[PDB]
Write a protein that binds this ligand. Structure first.
Ligand SMILES: CCCCCCCC/C=C/CCCCCCCC(=O)OC[C@H](COP(=O)(O)OCC[N+](C)(C)C)OC(=O)CCCCCCC/C=C/CCCCCCCC
Ligand SMILES: CCCCCCCC/C=C\CCCCCCCC(=O)OC[C@H](COP(=O)(O)OCC[N+](C)(C)C)OC(=O)CCCCCCC/C=C/CCCCCCCC
Ligand SMILES: CCCCCCCC/C=C\CCCCCCCC(=O)OC[C@H](COP(=O)(O)OCC[N+](C)(C)C)OC(=O)CCCCCCC/C=C\CCCCCCCC
Ligand SMILES: CCCCCCCC/C=C\CCCCCCCC(=O)OC[C@H](COP(=O)(O)OCC[N+](C)(C)C)OC(=O)CCCCCCC/C=C\CCCCCCCC
Ligand SMILES: CCCCCCCC/C=C\CCCCCCCC(=O)O[C@H](COC(=O)CCCCCCC/C=C/CCCCCCCC)COP(=O)(O)OCC[N+](C)(C)C
Ligand SMILES: CC(C)CCC[C@@H](C)[C@H]1CC[C@H]2[C@@H]3CC=C4C[C@@H](O)CC[C@]4(C)[C@H]3CC[C@]12C
Ligand SMILES: CC(C)CCC[C@@H](C)[C@H]1CC[C@H]2[C@@H]3CC=C4C[C@@H](O)CC[C@]4(C)[C@H]3CC[C@]12C
Ligand SMILES: CC(C)CCC[C@@H](C)[C@H]1CC[C@H]2[C@@H]3CC=C4C[C@@H](O)CC[C@]4(C)[C@H]3CC[C@]12C
Ligand SMILES: *[C@@H]1O[C@H](CO)[C@@H](O)[C@H](O)[C@H]1NC(C)=O
Ligand code: ALF
Ligand SMILES: [K+]
Ligand SMILES: [K+]
Ligand SMILES: [K+]
Ligand SMILES: [Mg+2]
Lengths: 986, 277
């Protein structure tokens, strides 16, 4: 961890510190011992957990601990029975089923558990392989890994910088620090101290950054992981090993259910000890409690629900790498978005052009077909000609039928923008450039800030030389003595100069780079056709020009971004722009997108409006704030918290990746779920620390797409509002699914409680309730995830993570007590009907379980005096168990119907709008019919055939459940916030 | 708040009370459809089971004639069962009717309705169980190697056993069929090697016949016909190998009497007797 940056030092101080020489370098022995001590110049990959331990750790998470305890108890019960010569089995079956359930749930949880992976593989595309380093004054090619701090390295154009160097000799070196700032604008390099911050010091080259053109010489200062990109990779790989909000909700639900199961098991085990029961009976009761109170199929059902949503989102070109990330977008409260590449198109494009003392507005959409800004007006022909002819950029080959804005261009960004504009608005400038012959003069020297090209008109009428020139507007104006306004030329009026200057100031205020244009026709009287031209600019005049127009470029936002941001802000989400660009451009883009509204106004703007000191204005009036990198590097964390809390609209500018991480962490300190969108290397630490990270697909980089939880393949920023829609719908339907899963636990638990307490014959077995848990409820649990939105999902506020939970006390109370008890009552009605219709009246079944389950007795006397053999008793027991199973199934049909809604009514939502619900009901019909009249024709797994009337006894209880739930929802609807909403709504 | 607590507790009290009321009402409506005189269904008890009296636990009998405690359990159980079959408890004539000593047709005592009052039961006297009655023989045969077990047919309401017609060949000629009035019962060794050690079999039934007389059927239901004494058949062996375990099977033959592989007591026995020296 080294941060003692010393770019202020002169060459000699660097020499003394690093013990080298420009002419000499480092000796071979010196370099070898450096390679021994400091370490290779290579990004060290991180330690990763092998997948098999990641898979094995899934077998102890969720409800699996309880299932393992149950399997151990099953084995203990079997060994006790085997000691006492009991070949009944029925317990190896249960143990095998429990182990299989554990294995399957672990498989599903492993499938849902993240993706792991590392970011280092993405950096290989940028890291150079070799480097031209000098040792003992000899220029040799050495692999970049072998390069070590202290040696002199020479960098040419078009190759990656071998390591972090301090430039000492430079000659026209321009680097591309897009990995540190996110901007592809070439940054010039020098050999002098420019800025205190090492990221803008202009005399330091950075590891893996590319040198666009020129030669440079520098002394290596940092290597390997101590470089800036090294720290970026270390941060992007060493953070993010944290749970997701949906994982926390599921863990809380598991904690509630496991606590309920443990408490009931402990208390009833103590009671069984206090009631003269054998240990075998007690442990069998404990196994039944454990199996009944655990929703085995729910944790896999949640995974399947997330998978279905992920597939139907990936159908919309939205790849979801982490399955848990489908939910997070929707509980998100803050979206920290990168500017360039994400909000904007990352392409320089003309936006405003000024002529006739008016400001014209140009379309900037990516898929635009034509431009129309009062083209029929005067002076436009001269502007068109000067834009077309005065350009050097050229299109790349193999572009016959390529979209115009998607055509690759070789040249400067500004030249590319003007060339794209001319191609769009004129169609074919290649013919126009060909027909107008170009004199071999185009001075584009540095420190000039202008360039001119002499042409001869192809029109037979005029046939005069033309000198078109564009460059910095001030230089254009100082060389201009007249302006062309609607054909004819006005003199250099004071009012015209004032209009020029105010247009300049306002166009700069919109954060755009203006370029001035001017041309001067050369009459043939003074310049003949055969007159020679010289590059020295002495053979032709460069004064007394005429100003035609003034164009500016913006790097505009994408077409769908402003509407998406407006919808996100209308959905209760707070959007923050965190960018590495200059504050002026960031503020302009924020105003142009919607992050800062037109009415909202910042502190600096208030100070400008009132002309008062910036310290005099009260910050309470300002509703927006723009914070630069320097204002944030010296900001105490409490100040950052207050800045985020106070201002609704914030823009961060000139921020390093570490500062982006700081902002994300500070936003998460407010108990807010944050989402980060980005498409660059500098966004990787933020894309990892964020709860959900979204990356662009076409414009994105490999590091960002590896560090993100979701990738937008078509770069449609509008997919965020659909993601929020899907996340909120997922949360609601997950509440519904959890309620429907938990409601069937009580009908499975009550029979064993009654069997222990009142000594009835076993109303239902453990394998039978496992059949309920695994077979019948799974498809309806999937079906409840297809419920449409009850109300305006995208009009609510984001849920509070701490206050609002997926499984609150209301849902658990309603699922266990209000419902579930009714289902147990209906099932017991069916059970008593089955037993009484064959001879055993309800009151004769009290405390009969000891004599009922005695294989010795074969003359048990029922209510009518008949004598029952042991096998007939257990066959009647199986009949009652199957009937109780069927009663549970039918009341679960009713409960599926009532769980289709939470506040609405089945009359409003619709019974048949969700066909997967009816598929689930049909599946239960088929499964129960099979389990009754197939398996059961041969008596196996405590299933027997049922009489026709035993299939319909519990139907009135299902109707009662439906009527009660309809009344509850009706009273919730009628009187909101009336002790009924607060207590009965879940 | 305290008022909120009171309101929620009142709601839960009324809600659970209403649920209990609905449950009890459904139970009452269901019970209104079952008769107190005959069961609605007899799906499981239609083929009657066969059961012995000593009520042995693991389907085994292991005792020693020497030590009284070795057979004390069996003797006490037989005494407990046969106490109610003593003629001293059957003397009253208002509730008992002396039915003839010769097997006859089943007696139809009216119909399963509250009218006609209670029913009268044919009396079964212990004298018919020769030398296993306990009148003038102690230990109920559990002297040196003379075990005997009382076989009974499980009670079923409205059950009229149909003895097999002697058209088809049932077994070796018993020299007395009397099919229309006696349900045949025969005890044989389970497999071949136990037939050589089981010894002779002595059957003691009413009228000297080897089976259950049909005059005692049908049963009427412990309400119309309480104090009903089912017919008994004492089976004594009198000859069996000492210090050897013999598996003996007793089967009740009839057209209506059924058997089952799943149910081992549906008209069959699996009893083992071992007489230690
Ligand atoms: C949420 C989960 C709920 C689960 C509920 C399980 C409940 C288990 C209880 C079952 C017993 C139900 C009895 C209901 C009978 C009907 C009500 C009644 O009016 O019946 C009066 C009884 C006679 O009815 P019968 O059967 O002869 O009718 C035969 C039908 N016919 C009349 C046509 C011949 O009068 C008599 O003879 C007997 C009089 C004496 C009765 C003493 C009972 C003492 C038993 C105490 C055990 C309580 C355990 C509680 C555990 C709770 C744990 C949460
Ligand atoms: C014989 C045995 C039969 C067993 C049958 C099933 C028994 C279990 C059934 C239900 C128990 C559900 C337990 C839920 C536990 C939640 C754990 C948890 O994570 O807690 C967090 C909550 C947070 O609260 P909040 O801010 O969301 O609340 C806001 C309320 N607002 C809006 C009014 C301000 O803390 C809280 O709510 C405080 C929670 C207080 C809970 C007190 C105990 C309630 C349990 C009662 C069951 C008693 C036995 C019933 C047996 C019936 C037999 C007929
Ligand atoms: C045993 C297993 C569980 C059994 C559980 C059964 C629970 C009862 C299921 C009841 C199903 C009702 C079917 C139904 O409601 O379908 C709804 C449709 C369309 O709804 P909509 O256009 O009005 O919605 C307007 C929506 N918005 C207001 C936004 C414009 O309407 C229709 O198909 C036609 C029906 C028109 C509305 C009802 C008119 C009166 C008919 C009543 C018969 C059903 C209820 C009485 C019987 C209950 C069971 C004893
Ligand atoms: C809200 C109500 C309307 C919504 C539900 C509509 C359901 C519509 C379904 C109808 C299908 C009915 C079932 C199929 C046809 C009946 C089959 C059957 O034969 O079923 C009769 C059983 C009792 O049989 P049994 O004595 O007549 O047989 C005598 C046999 N033998 C003569 C040999 C002694 O009826 C019983 O169990 C009655 C059980 C009573 C308890 C049910 C809950 C009542 C609470 C209210
Ligand atoms: C027969 C088929 C099954 C039937 C199931 C029946 C379910 C519904 C039962 C009771 C709910 C009745 C009240 C609905 C509206 C409440 C308004 C309210 O609670 O007002 C509140 C005060 O009320 C109370 O203190 C009493 C609370 C209600 C007590 C109900 C009776 C006690 C419990 C009964 C449950 C019985 C359930 C039995 C089911 C058995 C198994 C099926 C406060 O109102 P506020 O000043 O905020 O007004 C708001 C002003 N605004 C509207 C303009 C915004
Ligand atoms: C009479 C008997 C059945 C009542 C039993 C009530 C039990 C099962 C309920 C009531 C209160 C509940 C607890 C309330 C608080 C917490 C803390 C939470 O972090 C985990 C769940 C846990 C631990 C709950 C477990 C289940 C719980 C203990
Ligand atoms: C709202 C009501 C209709 C829901 C109740 C569904 C009931 C009535 C349906 C669902 C499953 C069906 C049963 C499935 C299996 C069998 C066995 C077959 O050999 C006879 C028909 C029978 C017995 C069906 C009868 C009708 C049935 C019981
Ligand atoms: C009938 C008896 C034996 C058991 C039932 C006890 C019930 C009625 C009592 C005991 C504890 C009570 C709960 C205590 C805590 C809460 C959480 C609160 O946010 C809503 C009320 C609620 C859910 C209460 C509802 C009523 C309650 C569940
Ligand atoms: C048992 O009773 C029979 C009845 O005939 C009798 O013949 C036999 O001798 C008795 N057995 C003994 C030895 O008690
Ligand atoms: F272009 Al950036 F963060 F400003 F990726
Ligand atoms: K369960
Ligand atoms: K993440
Ligand atoms: K369940
Ligand atoms: Mg970017």
């Amino acid at each position: 961890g080294m941060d003692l940056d010393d770019h202020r030092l002169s060459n000699t101080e660097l020499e003394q510190k690093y013990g080298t020489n420009i002419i000499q370098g480092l000796s071979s022995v010196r370099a070898t011992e450096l390679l021994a001590r400091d370490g290779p110049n290579t990004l060290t990959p991180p330690k990763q957990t092998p997948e098999i331990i990641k898979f094995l750790k899934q077998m102890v998470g969720g409800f699996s601990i309880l299932l393992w305890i149950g399997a151990a108890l099953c084995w203990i019960a079997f060994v006790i029975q085997y000691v006492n010569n009991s070949a009944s089995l029925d317990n190896v079956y249960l143990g095998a089923i429990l182990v299989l359930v554990v294995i399957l749930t672990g498989i599903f949880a492993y499938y849902q558990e993240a993706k792991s992976t590392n970011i280092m593989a993405s950096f290989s595309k940028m890291i150079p392989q070799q480097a031209l380093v000098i040792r003992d004054a000899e220029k040799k090619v050495i692999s970049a890994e072998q390069l070590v701090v202290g040696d002199v390295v020479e960098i040419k154009g078009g190759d990656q910088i071998p390591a972090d160097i301090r430039l000492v000799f430079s000659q026209g070196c321009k680097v591309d620090n897009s990995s540190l700032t996110g901007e592809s604008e070439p940054q010039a390099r020098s050999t002098e101290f420019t800025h205190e911050n090492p990221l803008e010091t202009k005399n330091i080259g950075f590891y893996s950054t590319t040198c666009l053109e020129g030669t440079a010489t520098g002394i290596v200062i940092n290597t390997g992981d101590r470089t800036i990109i090294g720290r970026i990779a270390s941060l992007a790989s060493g953070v993010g090993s944290e749970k997701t909000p949906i994982a926390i909700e599921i863990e809380h639900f598991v904690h509630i259910v496991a606590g309920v199961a443990v408490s009931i098991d402990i208390i009833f085990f103590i009671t069984a000890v206090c009631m003269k029961y054998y240990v075998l009976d007690a442990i069998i009761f404990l196994i039944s409690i454990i199996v009944a109170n655990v929703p085995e199929g729910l944790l896999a059902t949640v995974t399947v629900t997330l998978s279905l949503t992920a597939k139907r989102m990936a159908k919309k070109n939205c790849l979801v790498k982490n399955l848990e990330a489908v939910e997070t977008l929707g509980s998100t409260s803050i979206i920290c978005s990168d500017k360039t590449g994400t909000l904007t198109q990352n392409r320089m494009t003309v936006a405003h052009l000024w002529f006739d003392n008016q400001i014209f507005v140009a379309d900037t959409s990516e898929n635009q077909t034509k431009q129309a800004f009062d083209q029929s007006s005067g002076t436009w022909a001269s502007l068109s000609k000067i834009i077309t002819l005065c350009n050097r950029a050229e299109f790349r080959p193999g572009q016959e039928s390529v979209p115009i804005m998607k055509r690759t261009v070789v040249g400067d960004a500004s030249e590319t923008a003007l060339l794209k504009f001319s191609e769009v608005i004129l169609g074919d400038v290649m013919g126009i450039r060909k027909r107008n012959h170009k004199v071999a003069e185009i001075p584009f020297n540095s420190t000039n800030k202008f360039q001119l090209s002499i042409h001869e008109t192809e029109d037979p009428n005029n046939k005069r030389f033309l000198v078109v020139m564009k460059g910095a507007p001030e230089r254009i104006l100082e060389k201009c003595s007249t302006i062309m306004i609607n054909g004819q030329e006005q003199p250099l009026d004071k009012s015209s100069a004032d209009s020029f200057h105010t247009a300049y100031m306002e166009l700069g205020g919109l954060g755009e780079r203006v370029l001035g244009f001017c041309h001067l026709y050369l009459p043939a009287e003074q310049f003949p056709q055969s007159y020679i031209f010289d590059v020295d600019s002495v053979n032709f005049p460069t004064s007394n020009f005429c100003f035609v127009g003034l164009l500016s470029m913006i790097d505009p936002p994408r077409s769908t971004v402003p509407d998406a941001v407006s919808k996100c802000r209308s959905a209760g989400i707070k959007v923050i722009m965190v960018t590495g660009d200059h504050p002026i451009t960031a503020k302009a883009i924020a105003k142009s997108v919607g992050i800062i509204s037109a009415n909202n106004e910042t502190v600096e703007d208030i100070a400008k409006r009132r002309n008062i000191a910036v310290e005099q204005v009260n910050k309470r009036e300002a509703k927006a704030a723009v914070v630069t990198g320097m204002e944030l590097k010296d900001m105490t964390p409490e100040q950052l918290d207050e800045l985020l809390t106070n201002y609704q609209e914030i823009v961060f500018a000139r921020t390093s990746p570490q500062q982006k991480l700081i902002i994300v962490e500070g936003c998460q300190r407010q108990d807010a779920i944050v989402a980060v969108t980005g498409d660059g290397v500098n966004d990787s630490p933020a894309l990892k620390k964020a709860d959900i990270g979204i990356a662009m697909g076409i414009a994105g980089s490999d590091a960002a797409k590896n560090a993100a939880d979701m990738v937008l393949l078509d770069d449609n920023f509008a997919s965020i509002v659909t993601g929020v829609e899907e996340g909120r719908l997922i949360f609601d339907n997950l509440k519904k699914t959890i309620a429907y899963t938990l409601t069937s636990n009580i009908p499975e638990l009550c029979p064993f409680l009654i069997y222990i307490v009142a000594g009835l014959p076993l109303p239902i077995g453990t394998i039978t309730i496992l059949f309920i848990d695994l077979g019948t409820d799974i498809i309806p649990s999937i079906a409840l995830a297809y419920e449409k939105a009850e109300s305006d999902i995208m009009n609510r506020k984001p849920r509070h993570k701490k206050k609002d939970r997926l499984v609150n006390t209301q849902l658990a109370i309603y699922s266990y007590l209000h419902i579930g008890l009714m289902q147990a009552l209906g099932g017991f009605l069916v059970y008593f009907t089955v037993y009484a219709q064959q001879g055993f009246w309800p009151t004769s079944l009290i405390n009969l379980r000891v004599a009922w389950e005695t294989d010795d007795i074969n003359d048990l006397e029922d209510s009518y005096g008949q004598e029952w053999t042991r096998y007939q008793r257990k066959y009647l027991e199986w009949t009652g168990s199957t009937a109780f199973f069927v009663a549970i199934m039918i009341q679960q049909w009713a409960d599926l119907i009532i769980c289709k809604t939470r506040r609405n009514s089945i009359f409003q939502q619709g019974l048949f709008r969700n066909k997967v619900i009816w598929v689930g009901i049909a599946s239960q019909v088929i499964v129960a019919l099979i389990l009754s009249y197939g398996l059961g024709s041969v008596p196996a797994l405590s299933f027997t055939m049922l009489r026709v009337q035993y299939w319909f006894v519990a139907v009135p209880h299902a109707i009662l459940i439906w009527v009660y739930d309809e009344m509850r929802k009706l009273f919730i609807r009628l009187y909101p916030g009336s002790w009924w909403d607060k207590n009965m709504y879940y | 708040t305290g008022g909120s607590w009171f309101k929620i507790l009142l709601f839960y009290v009324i809600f659970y009370g209403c649920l209990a009321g609905i449950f009890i009402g459904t139970i009452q409506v269901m019970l209104l459809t079952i008769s107190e005189l005959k069961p609605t269904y007899q799906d499981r008890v239609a083929p009657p089971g066969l059961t012995q009296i000593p009520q042995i636990q693991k389907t085994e009998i292991s005792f020693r004639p020497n030590d009284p405690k070795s057979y004390e359990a069996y003797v006490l159980n037989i005494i407990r069962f046969l106490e109610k079959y003593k003629d001293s408890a059957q003397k009253d004539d208002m509730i008992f009717e002396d039915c003839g000593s010769m097997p006859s047709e089943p007696k139809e005592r009216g119909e399963f309705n509250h009218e006609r009052g209670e029913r009268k039961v044919c009396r079964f006297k212990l004298d018919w169980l020769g030398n296993c009655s306990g009148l003038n023989d102690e230990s109920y045969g559990y002297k040196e190697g003379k075990p005997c077990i009382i076989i009974k047919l499980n009670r079923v309401l409205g059950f009229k056993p149909k003895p097999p017609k002697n058209e088809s060949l049932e077994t070796y000629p018993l020299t007395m069929k009397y099919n229309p009035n006696v349900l045949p019962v025969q005890c044989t060794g389970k497999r071949d090697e136990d037939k050589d050690k089981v010894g002779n079999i002595e059957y003691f039934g009413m009228g000297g016949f080897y089976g259950f007389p049909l005059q005692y059927y049908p049963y009427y239901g412990k309400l119309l016909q309480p104090k009903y004494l089912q017919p008994l058949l004492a089976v004594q062996f009198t000859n069996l190998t000492l210090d050897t375990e013999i598996r003996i099977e007793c089967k009740a033959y009839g057209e209506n009497i059924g058997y089952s592989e799943k149910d081992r007591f549906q008209g069959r026995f699996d009893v083992k007797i071992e007489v230690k020296s």
